[PDB]
Scaffold this motif. Structure first.
Motif, PDB file in Angstrom:
ATOM      1  N   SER A 121      13.241  56.060 -50.253  1.00  0.00           N
ATOM      2  CA  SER A 121      12.371  55.235 -49.781  1.00  0.00           C
ATOM      3  C   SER A 121      11.780  55.077 -48.484  1.00  0.00           C
ATOM      4  O   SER A 121      10.813  55.564 -48.223  1.00  0.00           O
ATOM      5  CB  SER A 121      13.713  53.432 -49.980  1.00  0.00           C
ATOM      6  N   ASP A 122      12.140  53.942 -47.940  1.00  0.00           N
ATOM      7  CA  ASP A 122      10.652  54.170 -47.013  1.00  0.00           C
ATOM      8  C   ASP A 122      11.517  54.746 -45.736  1.00  0.00           C
ATOM      9  O   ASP A 122      10.497  55.906 -44.797  1.00  0.00           O
ATOM     10  CB  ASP A 122      11.352  52.270 -46.477  1.00  0.00           C
ATOM     11  N   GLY A 123      12.727  54.363 -45.312  1.00  0.00           N
ATOM     12  CA  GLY A 123      12.980  55.485 -44.446  1.00  0.00           C
ATOM     13  C   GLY A 123      13.757  54.726 -42.850  1.00  0.00           C
ATOM     14  O   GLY A 123      14.147  55.685 -41.703  1.00  0.00           O
ATOM     15  N   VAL A 124      13.909  53.090 -43.505  1.00  0.00           N
ATOM     16  CA  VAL A 124      14.216  52.625 -41.990  1.00  0.00           C
ATOM     17  C   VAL A 124      15.782  52.146 -42.539  1.00  0.00           C
ATOM     18  O   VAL A 124      15.713  51.979 -43.015  1.00  0.00           O
ATOM     19  CB  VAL A 124      13.348  51.852 -41.643  1.00  0.00           C
ATOM     20  N   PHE A 125      16.880  52.633 -40.983  1.00  0.00           N
ATOM     21  CA  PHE A 125      18.055  52.010 -41.629  1.00  0.00           C
ATOM     22  C   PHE A 125      18.160  50.586 -40.422  1.00  0.00           C
ATOM     23  O   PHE A 125      17.566  50.875 -39.232  1.00  0.00           O
ATOM     24  CB  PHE A 125      18.551  52.860 -40.683  1.00  0.00           C
ATOM     25  N   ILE A 126      18.031  49.198 -41.064  1.00  0.00           N
ATOM     26  CA  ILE A 126      18.114  48.525 -40.791  1.00  0.00           C
ATOM     27  C   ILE A 126      20.001  47.756 -39.948  1.00  0.00           C
ATOM     28  O   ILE A 126      20.549  48.445 -40.578  1.00  0.00           O
ATOM     29  CB  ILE A 126      18.214  47.097 -41.512  1.00  0.00           C
ATOM     30  N   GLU A 127      20.133  47.663 -38.670  1.00  0.00           N
ATOM     31  CA  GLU A 127      20.764  47.018 -37.597  1.00  0.00           C
ATOM     32  C   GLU A 127      20.337  45.608 -37.720  1.00  0.00           C
ATOM     33  O   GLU A 127      19.634  45.075 -36.354  1.00  0.00           O
ATOM     34  CB  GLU A 127      20.954  48.459 -36.828  1.00  0.00           C
ATOM     35  N   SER A 128      21.751  44.785 -37.817  1.00  0.00           N
ATOM     36  CA  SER A 128      21.006  43.862 -37.295  1.00  0.00           C
ATOM     37  C   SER A 128      22.588  42.632 -36.552  1.00  0.00           C
ATOM     38  O   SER A 128      23.388  43.113 -37.558  1.00  0.00           O
ATOM     39  CB  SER A 128      21.405  42.476 -38.270  1.00  0.00           C
ATOM     40  N   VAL A 129      22.240  41.594 -35.811  1.00  0.00           N
ATOM     41  CA  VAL A 129      23.453  41.580 -35.127  1.00  0.00           C
ATOM     42  C   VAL A 129      23.552  39.911 -35.003  1.00  0.00           C
ATOM     43  O   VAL A 129      21.891  39.403 -34.241  1.00  0.00           O
ATOM     44  CB  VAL A 129      23.566  42.081 -33.366  1.00  0.00           C
ATOM     45  N   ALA A 130      24.584  39.119 -36.079  1.00  0.00           N
ATOM     46  CA  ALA A 130      24.378  37.471 -35.658  1.00  0.00           C
ATOM     47  C   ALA A 130      25.481  36.546 -35.686  1.00  0.00           C
ATOM     48  O   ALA A 130      26.138  36.525 -37.256  1.00  0.00           O
ATOM     49  CB  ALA A 130      23.080  37.428 -36.771  1.00  0.00           C
ATOM     50  N   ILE A 131      26.113  37.008 -34.202  1.00  0.00           N
ATOM     51  CA  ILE A 131      27.556  35.917 -34.530  1.00  0.00           C
ATOM     52  C   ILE A 131      27.488  34.907 -33.681  1.00  0.00           C
ATOM     53  O   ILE A 131      26.794  34.414 -32.787  1.00  0.00           O
ATOM     54  CB  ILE A 131      28.062  37.089 -33.706  1.00  0.00           C
ATOM     55  N   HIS A 132      27.908  33.887 -34.299  1.00  0.00           N
ATOM     56  CA  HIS A 132      27.396  32.731 -33.750  1.00  0.00           C
ATOM     57  C   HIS A 132      28.198  32.060 -32.440  1.00  0.00           C
ATOM     58  O   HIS A 132      29.609  32.813 -32.076  1.00  0.00           O
ATOM     59  CB  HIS A 132      27.860  31.202 -34.436  1.00  0.00           C
ATOM     60  N   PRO A 133      28.027  31.515 -31.418  1.00  0.00           N
ATOM     61  CA  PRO A 133      28.977  31.160 -30.083  1.00  0.00           C
ATOM     62  C   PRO A 133      30.287  31.316 -29.909  1.00  0.00           C
ATOM     63  O   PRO A 133      30.181  30.258 -31.405  1.00  0.00           O
ATOM     64  CB  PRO A 133      27.877  30.665 -29.046  1.00  0.00           C
ATOM     65  N   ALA A 134      30.776  31.865 -28.720  1.00  0.00           N
ATOM     66  CA  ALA A 134      31.920  31.363 -28.948  1.00  0.00           C
ATOM     67  C   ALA A 134      32.907  30.839 -29.027  1.00  0.00           C
ATOM     68  O   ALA A 134      32.599  29.255 -28.374  1.00  0.00           O
ATOM     69  CB  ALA A 134      32.922  31.886 -27.605  1.00  0.00           C
ATOM     70  N   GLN A 135      33.628  29.892 -29.908  1.00  0.00           N
ATOM     71  CA  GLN A 135      33.474  28.324 -30.029  1.00  0.00           C
ATOM     72  C   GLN A 135      35.409  27.729 -29.466  1.00  0.00           C
ATOM     73  O   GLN A 135      35.268  26.999 -28.744  1.00  0.00           O
ATOM     74  CB  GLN A 135      34.214  28.106 -31.846  1.00  0.00           C
ATOM     75  N   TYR A 136      35.636  29.048 -28.843  1.00  0.00           N
ATOM     76  CA  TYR A 136      37.470  28.510 -28.231  1.00  0.00           C
ATOM     77  C   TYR A 136      36.594  28.940 -27.148  1.00  0.00           C
ATOM     78  O   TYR A 136      36.832  28.295 -26.051  1.00  0.00           O
ATOM     79  CB  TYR A 136      38.231  29.417 -28.586  1.00  0.00           C
ATOM     80  N   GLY A 137      36.184  30.368 -26.111  1.00  0.00           N
ATOM     81  CA  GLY A 137      35.898  30.316 -25.211  1.00  0.00           C
ATOM     82  C   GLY A 137      34.516  30.871 -24.180  1.00  0.00           C
ATOM     83  O   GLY A 137      33.837  30.197 -24.596  1.00  0.00           O
ATOM     84  N   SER A 138      34.650  31.943 -23.271  1.00  0.00           N
ATOM     85  CA  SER A 138      33.136  31.823 -22.936  1.00  0.00           C
ATOM     86  C   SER A 138      32.812  33.331 -23.643  1.00  0.00           C
ATOM     87  O   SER A 138      32.009  34.009 -22.651  1.00  0.00           O
ATOM     88  CB  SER A 138      33.267  31.996 -21.823  1.00  0.00           C
ATOM     89  N   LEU A 139      33.386  34.239 -23.938  1.00  0.00           N
ATOM     90  CA  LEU A 139      32.860  35.740 -24.616  1.00  0.00           C
ATOM     91  C   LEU A 139      31.457  36.049 -24.969  1.00  0.00           C
ATOM     92  O   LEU A 139      31.621  35.094 -26.033  1.00  0.00           O
ATOM     93  CB  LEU A 139      33.852  36.754 -24.943  1.00  0.00           C
ATOM     94  N   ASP A 140      30.636  36.238 -24.283  1.00  0.00           N
ATOM     95  CA  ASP A 140      29.225  36.157 -24.903  1.00  0.00           C
ATOM     96  C   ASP A 140      29.838  37.333 -26.464  1.00  0.00           C
ATOM     97  O   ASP A 140      29.341  38.058 -26.676  1.00  0.00           O
ATOM     98  CB  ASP A 140      27.907  36.714 -23.834  1.00  0.00           C
ATOM     99  N   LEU A 141      29.548  36.780 -27.594  1.00  0.00           N
ATOM    100  CA  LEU A 141      30.148  37.832 -28.792  1.00  0.00           C
ATOM    101  C   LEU A 141      28.913  38.429 -29.346  1.00  0.00           C
ATOM    102  O   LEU A 141      29.293  39.686 -29.455  1.00  0.00           O
ATOM    103  CB  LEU A 141      30.190  36.364 -29.561  1.00  0.00           C
ATOM    104  N   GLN A 142      28.161  38.421 -29.041  1.00  0.00           N
ATOM    105  CA  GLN A 142      26.177  38.693 -29.496  1.00  0.00           C
ATOM    106  C   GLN A 142      26.379  40.212 -28.480  1.00  0.00           C
ATOM    107  O   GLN A 142      26.078  40.644 -29.499  1.00  0.00           O
ATOM    108  CB  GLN A 142      24.844  38.115 -29.556  1.00  0.00           C
ATOM    109  N   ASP A 143      26.444  39.676 -27.102  1.00  0.00           N
ATOM    110  CA  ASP A 143      26.696  40.839 -26.683  1.00  0.00           C
ATOM    111  C   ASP A 143      27.542  41.800 -26.106  1.00  0.00           C
ATOM    112  O   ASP A 143      27.247  43.262 -26.976  1.00  0.00           O
ATOM    113  CB  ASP A 143      26.718  40.162 -24.637  1.00  0.00           C
ATOM    114  N   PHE A 144      28.721  41.662 -27.039  1.00  0.00           N
ATOM    115  CA  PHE A 144      29.879  42.017 -27.383  1.00  0.00           C
ATOM    116  C   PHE A 144      29.587  43.411 -28.451  1.00  0.00           C
ATOM    117  O   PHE A 144      29.844  44.206 -28.060  1.00  0.00           O
ATOM    118  CB  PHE A 144      31.090  41.996 -27.246  1.00  0.00           C
ATOM    119  N   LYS A 145      29.415  42.614 -29.225  1.00  0.00           N
ATOM    120  CA  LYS A 145      29.319  43.192 -30.569  1.00  0.00           C
ATOM    121  C   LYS A 145      27.679  44.336 -31.081  1.00  0.00           C
ATOM    122  O   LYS A 145      28.116  45.376 -30.694  1.00  0.00           O
ATOM    123  CB  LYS A 145      28.567  41.929 -31.784  1.00  0.00           C
TER     124      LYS A 145
END
Lengths: 160, 46
Positions: free
Chosen positions: A79-103
């Motif tokens: 088809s097009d030829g493009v792979f889509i990579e996406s990251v969407a994680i809600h901020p840590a609810q319990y602690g302080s770890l940047d989940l988006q950055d870690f992923k």
């Protein structure tokens, strides 16, 4: 029997976390768990008594995931030829770890490194069991864990 | 302690556990639980 169902409820949260950690698309991880549950329920009678149920379940999800990647890769190639990579994680609810950055850091790893470090460093599997899941030797898992760990340290800028 | 691959006192070992925990802090989707109920119900009629 209610027993198999109750065993699933114990593993289900970790199973979902595994799918999210493994996935390259944020909106595809949840369907992966659903498909795994349906396959596991059908094959529940093939589960070897006295063996690791969590490893059995993770194996199904892992194999279904790579199956999806292969299929999606063929559709992209035709088809097009493009792979889509996406990251969407809600901020840590319990602690302080940047989940988006870690992923995002996890996604910088190779597919083999990412899975290995999750299975060993997060999922609580032994080297033996993780090797069985990935269908490789113990030595391979260990080298994958070491390379993944060192890369994550440089990526997340942590000396340890 | 070179045989310690993960690093029992490393920050990365802790962050891996934290990431795994924070994901499980989120609600397990109702459709997933409802699917499990429906699977059990189908077994019951067998």
């Amino acid at each position: 029997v209610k027993d198999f169902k109750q065993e699933l409820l114990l593993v289900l949260p970790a199973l979902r976390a595994f799918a999210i950690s493994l996935s390259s698309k944020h909106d595809k991880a949840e369907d992966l768990v659903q498909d795994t549950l349906m396959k596991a329920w059908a094959k529940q009678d093939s589960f070897e008594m006295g063996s690791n149920l969590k490893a059995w379940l993770f194996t199904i999800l892992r194999n279904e995931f790579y199956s999806q990647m292969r299929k999606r890769g063929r559709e992209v190639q035709d088809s097009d030829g493009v792979f889509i990579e996406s990251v969407a994680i809600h901020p840590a609810q319990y602690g302080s770890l940047d989940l988006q950055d870690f992923k995002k850091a996890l996604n910088m790893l190779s597919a083999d490194q990412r899975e290995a470090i999750i299975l060993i460093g997060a999922s609580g599997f032994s080297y033996e069991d993780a090797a069985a899941i990935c269908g490789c030797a113990i030595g391979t898992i260990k080298s994958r864990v070491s390379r993944a760990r060192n890369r994550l340290q440089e990526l997340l800028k942590v000396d340890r | 302690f070179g045989d310690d691959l993960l690093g029992v006192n490393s920050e990365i070992a802790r962050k891996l556990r934290q990431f795994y925990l924070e994901i499980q802090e989120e609600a397990l989707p109702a459709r997933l639980l409802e699917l499990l109920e429906r699977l059990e119900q189908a077994e019951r009629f067998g």
